[PDB]
């Protein structure tokens, strides 16, 4: 893809620091602030069962893939107005490459 692949070992380092506090990637894992990310790729925005999202995540309605995910992580509040997630955003391309690569395998 136009969005390359990086180290999944470095991506986990990014996920443990910048993600794990709000999310969990294991199958049947617990939600915390944000919805569980297992099987997020190839899924709809905000369809995770049992938890309350904002009106934004539905009325955007994008299939999560390696491209728009990268677009969503650079400026979370630019891509989807009204989103709950409070995140500085990943401003470095390699950081997005590594993290999504880790997310690629972890949410399988």
């Amino acid at each position: 893809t136009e969005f390359k692949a990086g180290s999944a070992k470095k991506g986990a380092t990014l996920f443990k620091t910048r993600c794990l506090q709000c999310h969990t990637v294991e199958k049947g894992g617990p939600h915390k602030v944000g919805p569980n990310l297992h099987g997020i790729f190839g899924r709809h925005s905000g369809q995770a069962e049992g938890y309350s999202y904002t009106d934004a995540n539905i009325k955007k309605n994008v299939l999560w893939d390696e491209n728009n995910m990268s677009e969503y992580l650079t400026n979370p509040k630019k891509y989807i107005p009204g989103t709950k997630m409070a995140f500085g955003g990943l401003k470095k391309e390699k950081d997005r490459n590594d993290l999504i690569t880790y997310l690629k395998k972890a949410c399988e």
Partner: protein, 294 residues
């Protein structure tokens, strides 16, 4: 003979655009070194650094404050309660070498303003004119608050900063940022799930979470929650005092109200002890890196 007077004198031939560049230098370095403190960033420690140097102010004799920018000397950066702020200092030093003209006071205070804005906080008006003073103007130890204390000590301390209940509760919203480092202050853990983003989570977590008083590995006592968060005694006292509680409850519902109150209270904190001339320019409102296309 009156308490000493600190008049704000703008650096020679310096204007808005010159200070906007200093902002950009700091705002870039924040995005640049993002690995600091397990990817929290230098944002929170720069907000504390601006608070720490401005928290030395005494309204009675007008001693201390951000004016002198005397935070550089063995007396005041080696204290017990400033531990960890050296990182914020080393952060602004290569930037000050880039702009040797700017005063230490204006640099530190701006560094606090910059951090808050880039963390997606409210716009904070910032004024220049702070003047560096000789080492004889350096304050003494213990003019900053103790973390293990109650609501009474908090209200009492902030009176010396000329801060009322409205302003102090707003200012405490900043403790949603960063964390406590056991190696530094003797407390451990963050206050919420967003450390590097400016939000009202502080007030939300305070009354929403279930708090238990426990002991850390420094033998100090802090309020911990099942979610892994923490609160200092001085922080937990805000829901203990009924007058503090109503304002805590309000900011939890209205984040916009919290932003506007914080901005005024934070600017006032940074501007405490400064006499601004009538010919002084209106307060600068700096553009975020997000508004410049970055």
């Amino acid at each position: 003979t009156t308490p000493l007077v600190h008049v704000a004198s703008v650096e020679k031939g310096r204007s808005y655009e010159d200070f906007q560049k200093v902002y950009n230098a700091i705002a870039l370095k924040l995005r640049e070194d993002d690995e600091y403190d397990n990817y929290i960033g230098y944002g929170p420690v720069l907000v504390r650094l601006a608070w720490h140097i401005s928290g030395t102010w005494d309204k009675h004799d007008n001693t201390g404050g951000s004016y002198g920018g005397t935070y550089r000397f063995k007396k005041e950066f080696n204290d017990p309660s400033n531990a960890g702020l050296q990182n914020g200092f080393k952060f602004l030093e290569p930037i000050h070498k880039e702009f040797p003209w700017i005063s230490s006071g204006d640099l530190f205070s701006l560094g606090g303003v910059t951090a808050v804005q880039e963390m997606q906080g409210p716009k904070i008006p910032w004024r220049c004119g702070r003047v560096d003073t000789p080492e004889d103007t350096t304050p003494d130890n213990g003019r900053l608050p103790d973390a293990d204390k109650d609501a009474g000590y908090v209200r009492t301390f902030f009176q010396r900063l000329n801060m009322n209940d409205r302003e102090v509760v707003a200012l405490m919203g900043a403790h949603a940022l960063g964390k406590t480092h056991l190696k530094n202050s003797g407390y451990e853990g963050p206050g919420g799930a967003a450390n590097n983003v400016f939000t009202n989570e502080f007030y939300l977590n305070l009354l929403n979470e279930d708090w238990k008083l426990e002991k850390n590995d420094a033998n100090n006592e802090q309020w911990d929650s099942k979610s892994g968060y923490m609160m200092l005694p001085t922080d937990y006292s805000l829901i203990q005092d009924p007058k503090y509680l109503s304002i805590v409850k309000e900011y939890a519902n209205d984040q916009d109200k919290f932003f506007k109150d914080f901005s005024k209270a934070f600017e006032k904190l940074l501007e405490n002890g400064i006499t601004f001339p009538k010919d002084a320019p209106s307060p600068f409102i700096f553009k975020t890196l997000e508004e410049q296309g970055l």
